[PDB]
Design a protein around this ligand. Structure first.
Ligand code: GDP
Ligand code: MG
Ligand code: MG
Ligand code: MG
Ligand code: MG
Length: 192
């Protein structure tokens, strides 16, 4: 949401949210691997025993100058199993858009629903509803042999089909850029 006169940049924050081990890191790292060195900052991981945050910023090469001003995307996620809520609540501060990385595993179906309820709860602390922020659903791990039907996964996190849904196999980069383009489209629309 930030404007930075000094370096001539507007800054958008994109949060990858979802149950633990759904593929959030993997999305971030695939993306970070295809950005040229000169257009990205460092990928940074801050951790305690119980908590983690991982983030980087980059200048997408797909985006026009809004009157001399470049666009910088900052991608944030709370990777790993989650022990406390505090890093997931904080991750959402000043969020512009969110990718929800759902796990296609039968035994993570409940974890999907749980993380979505939690995102909704954390958003509510900032006075925001699920209608107030662009949210895209990525159904990741479509390669698993017992991958649930996409419609089933979608049904527990988005029963009225309010959000765009994309399939992914983040370990192979599949769906990864298309998911980032989708949230990008919605965030940049709101801007202009
Ligand atoms: N089979 C499969 N494994 C995946 C996929 N995406 C991520 N993983 C694996 O899932 C585990 C958790 O992924 P990670 O990105 O670290 O999770 P997160 O950051 O906690 O959401 C890792 O072992 C990944 O290799 C996928 O599309 N298919
Ligand atoms: Mg996590
Ligand atoms: Mg950076
Ligand atoms: Mg599932
Ligand atoms: Mg809410």
């Amino acid at each position: 949401s930030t404007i930075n006169f000094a370096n001539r940049e507007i800054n958008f924050k994109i949060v990858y949210y979802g149950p633990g081990l759904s593929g959030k890191t993997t999305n971030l790292k695939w993306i970070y691997s295809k950005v040229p060195e000169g257009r990205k900052g460092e990928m940074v991981s801050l951790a305690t025993e119980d908590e983690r945050t991982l983030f980087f910023d980059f200048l997408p090469l797909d985006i026009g100058e809004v009157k001399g001003f470049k666009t910088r995307f900052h991608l944030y996620t709370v990777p790993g199993q989650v022990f406390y809520n505090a890093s997931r609540k904080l991750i959402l501060r000043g969020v512009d858009g969110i990718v929800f990385v759902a796990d296609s595993a039968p035994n993570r179906l409940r974890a999907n629903a749980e993380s979505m309820r939690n995102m909704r709860e954390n958003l509510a602390e900032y006075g925001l509803t699920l209608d107030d922020v662009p949210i895209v659903i990525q159904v990741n791990k479509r390669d698993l042999p017992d991958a649930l039907p996409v419609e089933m996964v979608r049904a527990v996190v988005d029963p009225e089909g309010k959000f765009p849904v994309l399939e992914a196999v983040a370990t192979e980069g599949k769906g990864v850029f298309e998911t980032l383009k989708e949230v990008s489209r919605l965030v940049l629309a709101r801007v202009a």
